Structures are given as structure tokens and as C-alpha cells.
Design a binder for this molecule. Structure first.
Ligand code: ACO
Ligand code: ACO
Lengths: 390, 239, 390
């Protein structure tokens, strides 16, 4: 059964991923985006008292300007979450959002809380991924300064694993299509939380879809693209890469016991968590080391998992992962069924729980039992979670 | 047309929506004098009584939206006995408050400058779409007074205490860019596509897409700030 | 006895707090400062294999420029810590460093790790506390924009609790005095880790003391100071406030079992952890709510604790805390014995574990049993830990 201290997910809600370049969130702050998302998610589950939120753990990378000074609290203050509650912003680069989920869980398990709210935000339109970056010369002494440029780290993993430009563009058109497909069939309605935004002309209106998705993507169009990172002989292009997206994800978590008391069916139950490190140069390979550690803790075999949600950092990196994980042949059958970051974007601070959330829905929709959400991280890291519907 | 005055004309539009436009005939601007007010009073009563109206829009047929009244009239009014002045402003505010209580989504189409009463009028409506070149402000303190038409009431509940004080105490004019950043205006557009943006928003408000009833509520109830935060925010503002 | 999953502190090491305005760290980066400190602390305890560092949790607030992009990993990469290990940067404003300790502990307890390295850095000389700050107008709607200016939040708590300018300045001269005292008697030798720095002229040399400490402080000199925050009628001045310090703290933590195996005497054993929220205006009152929660979990009474280490954010705030905690009368007997942030500085990202570390030494020196490290946080938060020597 469920032990009183097990980590139960009560709900998951994400904002409609928008284009950073003059998109639907161009006039919306990162904080007001997060504070909002959280407010709405809570309103859906009224049986949970916001006053019980032991701690608001939010994930955010470029913690400067709007995203500076523990944005977790800045958001919690503009919510129905009392001042009595706490708040902390976790940063583990791309995996920030997912580490938050872990941190809270661990808290719930150790008996230092009962109801936490974890999420993540990242407004790349207002805080460019290259804003305020001071390269430390002393890094070149112990590592490669080039290992920083995420695109190149995809290039290397691609070559070492021999991923062709064709293979990549193909996976790209797949993400877009599958994403679009799921959007239409409203497979995203349950997780997407409507939100005020502004169209081209700047007209205020509500969005319930993802601007990022580009259904007009074809091998013929992605072939025209030029290497975005390696000029002379590049494979990774702007088309097989994740999109610069302004977005936020949210989740309500609590012990299994508290969940039992309030009486409400879990969206899933975390069974294991893990993180791992890899060389900065081949950071895209992070998922495999972390996945293994996670499964071993879960006491399962990669074959026991029904659905997978691997964040699509790069095509040249996502593919090798699946391959080495020995699930590439099972892709279209159980991998990123609702599309990935190539079509949904990759809002650093957000992505973490985002895929972890979407993964739960894919399970609730196709009757899954065990799901796996994993993703590579910058500078060489990996993180994955293993949930179970029950 | 639903209403036809010398300063205000309530013309009917599509889908039962209606446009209330400020076009003071004979002058070059728009100001809240005895006439303007008395007409807006009638204009509202017409709408409020017309059970066909489903949406209201507030526009201006001049280069500016609505500037301040003739300084001349000010001198006059402030000469009246206290009990009379207050009684005069109470009636004036009711005109706005009533327009604020219309069981119909209202949008202010700020095309140009909107100072004092001009801005206070907009503060009454639910949503607000401003032109990218327009400006809005409450230059009351420059005359030794402060917002009289519910300015010190709506502004704080719309943009926030700290901002409301920063806007009123300075009476500075605020540009479109900073106007949306503090949420004084909901949407910003260009002079040529303003009318479109307004008309569009209304339809969405009517369609139920946007909860106009929930957006108005905030300036009908007490401030959001805590008790500690009030004292904190206020005592510092005073200091 | 010690359960296999108990959180044991193996060691604590901090850098010589330096003056941000042309101090000893003026030419030292935040990363290289952290990566260094960590390297040295590990070298002291050779029995612990750096390869076992499951995760490097570092605390840092102004995560931009040097301190941007998960500085936790940036440091771990320039250490003997393998690439296989992970790393995350925790931000909870002032309490960041202490939250890191908690996160790891929780990890060790839940069985998702065995040996973690937690610390915190904050180079305020290179990343001013007011650098890259975009005030959100929408905040004024739910709270007071003024609650941001930390100094004013001290002013308010001071008035509400009637703390006099005399009382503050007095507590100030106390911190400097006791800090200097402890420095001399080498009561800081064990925790301070020598480090290359540059004196006035810019001569490269090693520092093993704290520049921040100013022994020439007297009620007569602090009386001359002028209100730093409230012009007409101020009580909080630049003298009763913490110093802008460039510093970093480090700690090695691991399960009690792993500690048993490797065979090494614990520096202390975490017994409880907690966080709490308070109104942004009176954020300085955060310690009391958190301390209560912490003790309640520890199953102890404020009277069972032998020594306390309360971070000295402001005199006007530290005093009320002690009072309401009902330990003010026990101050000089068991409170900030080696001085506080008023004399040692307050490097946001660092302070957290810093006081937590110093507290352990005060116990190891005066034969203490249970210690309490607590501190207020910005925007209204509190955090405290309760260790035990055994
Ligand atoms: C570790 C982890 O888990 S996360 C991995 C980290 N990933 C990242 O940081 C993302 C890095 N990528 C980026 O920053 C950007 O996308 C870049 C650098 C690759 C490209 O940015 P830019 O240099 O500005 O070039 P840009 O994006 O404008 O080029 C895209 C062009 O291709 C076209 N294009 C892009 N995607 C598609 C598509 N799917 N179909 C058709 N055309 C497309 C665009 O229309 C555009 O052409 P245009 O200029 O005529 O409009
Ligand atoms: C929530 C938490 O847990 S943490 C709380 C957060 N706290 C803060 O953010 C406050 C941080 N402090 C500050 O930012 C600064 O110290 C301030 C704003 C208070 C004052 O800074 P400034 O305006 O630059 O004044 P400054 O720091 O130069 O010092 C003022 C004078 O007092 C003198 N002074 C300071 N301390 C002492 C002392 N102990 N003895 C004698 N003289 C002293 C200085 O030498 C200086 O004199 P000088 O100019 O002749 O050299």
C-alpha cells in the first residue's frame, strides 16, 4: 500500500508555452507568470488549504532582474499562499524544475512537511540565456571553455554516436507533429492552464494552446536549414534544437497520508529519484547515468517502464540517449508521445517538472503504470524521476 | 442614435455593442465641465435603460482623449461652501460609479492624453486599451489638490499602493510603455489599430472569455495588502 | 545510538571573511573561491573519497555573472570532485547556505546518497546586492515595495519591539569585541581555512584572519554614525548592520553509517530542521517561527539548548528575536560567543552554513551538547537547524 510518508502528486498545470521572440508572454513578467499559474492550480484543488504549503520550491536559472532574489517567494507572496509559508528557488540549470520536485519529496519523506508546491519558471524573452555571463578563465584550466556552448556539446555526442542530419531532422518533424496531434485531440487540455496573453497586434486575450508548435515542419524544410553551431560540416541546426520558450510549470505535492485524509485520487506516486554527472563536453549523455541510478533505486528494469518523457535538448543528443537506454526501437510506442521540447520549447527553470508533469498525463491517458522522466543538464549532469500510477 | 449630445454621442455598433464617444463640438479638446458631466449622466442613463446594449466602448473624436477642465471653472468651484462643493463632487462621482456598475463590459479606448478627470473616467471602465503614443496621468497635486473623481480610490486598487502614491504625488504624465508595466492599461496598440483592439476585446468580454466582472471587483473592495504591509507601505510613503 | 541514515557533519571550513570594498578577495572570483575552499576541506579529511560526493549543493543569491549558471557545478569541476558527481545551487536569499545543508541531509536520510558536500558563496564585491534588480510593480498590489529594503524592515521590527539606538550600538560593539577576542585566542583557527589574498598595495599573501572585524569600535564611535535608512528619526545605522563581505563557507556531510565505516568522529549530528514565513515588513522576526518549528521537531525546549548562533542581520532585529525566544538574559552566556555578522560580515550565499559551522565549534570548545543555528530571511522567511555533539 501507500506508506504515510510516500510522495504523492496531487495535480500538474503548465502555462501555454509561448515564443520568446514577440510571443504571447512578451508583456508578462516571470514572477506574475509563476504566481499566477500557482494560484490557478490551487484553485482547481480546493480541498488543499494553501495555508498548509510548507514550502514553495521553484526552479529558475537566470536568477537576475525579474528572476532574481528567490523568485519562489516573490511568487508565493502574490498568491493565496500565506506569508507563514516558506519558499526557495532551486537551480540545477536545465534540471532545476525537477530537482525542486525531489527536494520537496525528500522533505515530505523525512517528516519536515506535509504539503509542498513545486514548479519552475523561465522567461527567456526578458532574461536571455546569454544575459549576464562572465566566463571564468580558470575554467579552461580544468575543462573546455567550449563545453559551455550547449550546441557544440550536441555536435560531439552526435558524432561519437553517429547521428545523421537526416536522423535528426526526422526526429524534429516527429516532435512537432506528435505535439500538434496531441494539441488537437485535446490531450493537453487537462494539463494546460489558460492564461492571458497578447497576440501579434497586442490584443489581450486568453491562450490555451502552444505557439511554439510548428505543424508545417517537414524533412524538406528542415533540410534547408544551415548548421547553427558548426559552420563547416555541422549536423545540429536551429530546427533540431529546443525552442527559446517563455513558460512556467507547476505542481502540488503532499504525503500519501495527508492525501488519504483529504481524500483525493493521486495523479501519480514518486518511486525513485536520482542525479548523475558526466563530462561537460558530452553533457547530452547525462540521462543514461541518472536513469540507471534511478531505476536501480526503483528496483525496476528499463523494460518495466510503460512510458518515457525525455526532454528534447537536441536531436543529436536525445537519440543517443534512447539508443544507449535500449528503448529507441520502442520510441513511437512509449517515448515523448505528446511531442517534446523541439516543438514545446525548453524554458530552463520550467522544463524540469514540465516533462515530469506531461509524463503523468500520458500515463493517465494510455493506462500506464510506471513512467520515467529524465533529462540532460548543462556542464555535465543528469536527473530522472520514476513515478507510478496507482 | 441611442444618444446625441453636444459633447457625447452614444452610437450603436455591431453585435449590440455600443460606442460612447467624447466629441465636444466647437472646442478643440475634451474636458469635464458642467455640460460634459451632465451629458455623460444622460448618456449612461440611456445605456442603463436600453435593455439591448450588451457592450460599451469609450472613445474620443479628438486628438486627445480627455484633458482637464478650464482652470477657470476650478477657481469657481473651490469658492463654493464646503457642504456645496462636496455635494457637487458626490453627484459627479455617482455618474462615474454608475457607469462602473453597468451590467455590461466597458472598455476605455485611450487614443490620446487623458489627464485628471480624463484618466479618472477610464479608471471607471473595466478594461483599457491605450495608443502607443498616448499618455495618462493625475496632475492634481500641481494645483494643490489630488484626484477628485475617484482617482485616489481606483488607482491604488488597480496598479498598487506604492505605484498609486508615486503617480499621484508626482502628477507626472506616464507614457504607454510604463503605463502597461504597472497595469494601468490592459493592452497597448497603435493609433491605427486602436479601434480594432477595443472592439475585439469587448467581444471577448461579452463572450465570457474574459471575466470582466472579476476584473472590476478589485476596485470595489478593500486593498489587498496585509495590515503590516499597509503601515509599512504607507508610513514610508509619508516619510 | 546513531541510525545508519542519520545526517553527520564531518567537518566545517570557511574562508577569511574579507572587505568587499578593496579587500583581500577583490581579485578572487566567487567560483575559484568556492572551488578552492572545497578542495582544501576535502584535503583535510582524506578518508573520504571525493568520488563519493553524490551531490555538491552550494548556496548563492545573486546568481548572475560569476555566480550564474549553477555555480555549484562550476566549482565542483575545478575540484578533485569527479565529473560523475552532481551539483545544484540553492537560493533562499540569506538562508540559502543553510537550506543546502537541509536539502542534502534530507537526501541522505531518504537513501538517495551517502556523502554530500554543502556550502555557500557570495562575492558582493563583484556582484553588488543591488546589481540587476527589476522591481515588479505588481508587488505593490499584494505587499509593500518598501518591505524590500532590508534596512527598513529592521527599523519597523525595532520600533514595534522598542529597541533603542543605545541598545543596538551596544550589541554592535559586542559582536566586534567577541569576534576579535575569539580571533586572538585562535578559537577560529580550527574553522578558518588559510587562503591567498591581496593586501592594500596588492601584494599576494596568505590570510588566516578576518578583515571585517574592527576592534576599535566603541559606543562613542557608533554614536557618531547617522541613520543609514531612516533620515529623520532613525535607529538602525551602518554600524549596527552586517558588513558587505566577500566570503564562502563549506561543509562535508554524510550518513552516520558511512561515517561509522570510514571511522571518524562526527563534528555534530543534525537533529531537526525547519523553515517558516513571516510578513515581508517584519522579516527580521523570522527566526522565532522557524526556531519553534525546529525545536518541536527536535523534541526539545529552548532551555535544553546549550549554545546559539543567530545570524546578526541587524541589531534592531537580532535583539527582538533573542527576547521573544526568551534567551536574551542568557546572551553573553550562550549566544554568538565568537561574534556575529556585525563583525564577521554577511555574505548571503555563505552566511547560512557559516553560522551553522561556527556554532559547531563553539560546542566543541565549551563542551556543548545541543546547538541552534537560526536566521531571518529577506521578504519574510526563517530557517534554523538543531545539531547535537555526540
Ligand atoms: C541540457 C538541456 O537539457 S537543454 C539544451 C540547451 N539548448 C539551448 O540552449 C538552445 C540553443 N539554441 C538557441 O539559443 C537558438 O535556437 C539558436 C542559437 C540555435 C538559433 O538562434 P539564432 O542564431 O537567432 O537563429 P534563428 O533561431 O533565428 O534561426 C532559425 C531560422 O530557422 C527557421 N526555423 C527554425 N525552426 C524551424 C522549423 N521547425 N521549421 C522550419 N523553419 C524553422 C526560422 O524560421 C528561422 O529563419 P528566419 O530567420 O527566416 O525566420
Ligand atoms: C535577512 C538577513 O538575514 S540579512 C540582512 C541584510 N542586510 C543588509 O542588506 C544591509 C547591508 N549593509 C549595507 O548595505 C551597508 O552597510 C549600508 C547601506 C547599511 C551602509 O553603507 P554606506 O552608506 O556605504 O556607509 P559605509 O558602509 O561606507 O559606512 C559608514 C561609516 O561607518 C563606519 N563604520 C562602520 N562600522 C563601524 C564600526 N564597527 N566601528 C567604527 N566605524 C564603523 C565606516 O568606517 C564608515 O566611515 P567612513 O566613511 O569614514 O569610512
Amino acid at each position: 500500500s501507500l506508506n504515510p510518508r510516500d510522495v504523492v502528486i496531487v495535480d500538474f498545470g503548465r502555462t501555454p508555452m509561448g515564443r520568446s521572440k514577440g510571443g504571447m508572454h512578451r508583456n508578462t513578467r516571470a514572477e506574475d507568470m509563476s504566481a499566477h499559474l500557482i494560484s490557478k492550480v490551487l484553485e482547481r484543488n480546493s480541498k488543499v488549504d494553501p495555508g498548509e504549503v510548507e514550502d514553495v520550491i521553484w526552479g529558475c536559472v537566470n536568477q537576475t532582474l525579474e528572476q532574481g532574489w528567490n523568485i519562489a517567494r516573490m511568487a508565493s507572496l502574490m498568491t493565496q499562499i500565506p506569508h507563514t509559508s516558506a519558499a526557495q528557488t532551486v537551480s540545477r540549470l536545465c534540471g532545476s524544475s525537477m530537482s525542486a520536485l525531489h527536494t520537496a519529496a525528500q522533505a515530505i519523506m523525512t517528516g519536515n512537511g506535509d504539503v509542498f508546491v513545486v514548479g519552475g519558471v523561465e522567461h527567456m524573452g526578458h532574461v536571455s540565456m546569454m544575459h549576464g555571463v562572465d566566463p571564468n578563465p580558470h575554467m579552461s584550466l580544468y575543462a573546455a571553455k567550449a563545453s559551455g556552448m550547449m550546441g557544440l556539446t550536441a555536435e560531439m555526442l552526435g558524432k561519437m554516436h553517429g547521428i545523421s542530419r537526416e536522423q535528426q531532422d526526422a526526429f524534429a518533424v516527429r516532435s512537432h507533429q506528435l505535439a500538434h496531434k496531441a494539441t488537437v485531440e485535446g490531450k493537453f487540455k487537462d494539463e494546460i492552464i489558460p492564461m492571458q496573453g497578447y497576440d501579434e497586434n497586442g490584443f489581450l486575450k486568453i491562450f490555451d494552446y502552444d505557439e511554439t508548435i510548428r505543424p508545417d515542419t517537414t524533412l524538406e524544410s528542415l533540410a534547408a536549414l544551415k548548421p547553427a553551431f558548426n559552420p563547416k560540416g555541422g549536423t545540429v541546426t536551429a530546427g533540431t534544437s529546443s525552442q527559446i520558450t517563455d513558460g512556467a510549470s507547476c505542481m502540488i505535492v503532499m504525503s500519501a497520508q495527508r492525501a488519504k485524509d483529504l481524500g483525493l485520487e493521486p495523479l501519480a506516486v514518486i518511486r525513485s529519484m536520482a542525479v548523475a554527472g558526466v563530462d561537460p563536453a558530452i553533457m547530452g549523455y547525462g540521462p543514461v547515468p541518472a536513469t540507471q541510478k534511478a531505476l536501480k533505486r526503483a528496483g525496476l528494469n528499463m523494460a518495466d517502464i510503460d512510458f518515457i518523457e525525455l526532454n528534447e535538448a537536441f536531436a543529436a543528443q536525445a537519440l543517443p540517449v534512447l539508443k544507449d537506454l535500449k528503448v529507441l526501437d520502442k520510441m513511437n510506442e512509449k517515448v515523448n508521445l505528446h511531442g517534446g521540447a523541439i516543438a514545446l520549447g525548453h524554458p530552463f527553470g520550467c522544463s524540469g517538472a514540465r516533462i515530469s508533469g506531461t509524463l503523468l498525463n500520458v500515463m493517465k491517458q494510455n493506462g500506464g503504470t510506471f513512467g520515467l522522466s529524465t533529462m540532460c543538464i548543462g556542464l555535465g549532469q543528469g536527473i530522472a524521476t520514476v513515478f507510478e500510477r496507482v | 442614435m441611442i444618444y446625441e449630445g453636444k459633447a457625447i454621442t452614444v452610437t450603436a455598433l455591431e453585435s449590440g455593442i455600443v460606442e460612447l464617444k467624447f466629441d465636444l463640438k466647437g472646442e478643440s479638446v475634451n474636458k469635464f465641465n458642467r455640460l460634459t458631466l451632465n451629458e455623460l449622466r444622460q448618456a449612461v442613463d440611456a445605456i442603463k435603460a436600453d435593455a439591448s446594449v450588451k457592450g460599451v466602448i469609450v472613445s474620443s473624436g479628438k486628438d486627445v482623449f480627455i484633458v482637464g477642465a478650464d482652470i477657470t471653472e476650478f477657481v469657481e468651484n473651490f469658492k463654493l461652501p464646503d457642504a456645496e462643493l462636496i455635494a457637487g463632487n458626490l453627484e459627479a462621482n455617482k455618474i462615474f460609479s454608475d457607469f462602473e456598475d453597468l451590467n455590461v463590459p466597458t472598455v476605455a479606448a485611450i487614443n490620446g492624453i487623458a489627464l485628471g478627470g480624463g484618466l479618472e473616467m477610464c479608471l471607471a471602465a473595466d478594461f483599457r486599451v491605450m495608443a502607443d503614443s498616448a499618455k495618462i496621468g493625475l496632475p492634481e497635486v500641481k494645483l494643490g489638490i489630488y484626484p477628485g473623481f475617484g482617482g485616489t480610490v481606483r488607482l491604488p486598487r488597480l496598479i498598487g499602493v506604492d505605484n498609486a502614491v508615486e503617480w499621484i504625488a508626482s502628477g507626472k504624465e506616464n507614457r504607454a510603455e510604463d503605463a502597461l508595466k504597472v497595469s494601468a492599461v490592459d493592452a497597448v496598440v497603435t493609433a491605427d489599430k486602436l479601434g480594432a483592439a477595443a472592439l475585439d476585446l469587448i467581444k471577448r468580454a461579452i463572450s465570457g472569455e474574459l471575466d470582466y466582472k472579476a476584473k472590476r471587483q478589485p476596485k470595489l473592495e478593500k486593498l489587498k495588502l496585509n495590515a503590516i504591509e499597509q503601515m509599512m507601505a504607507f508610513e514610508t510613503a509619508k516619510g
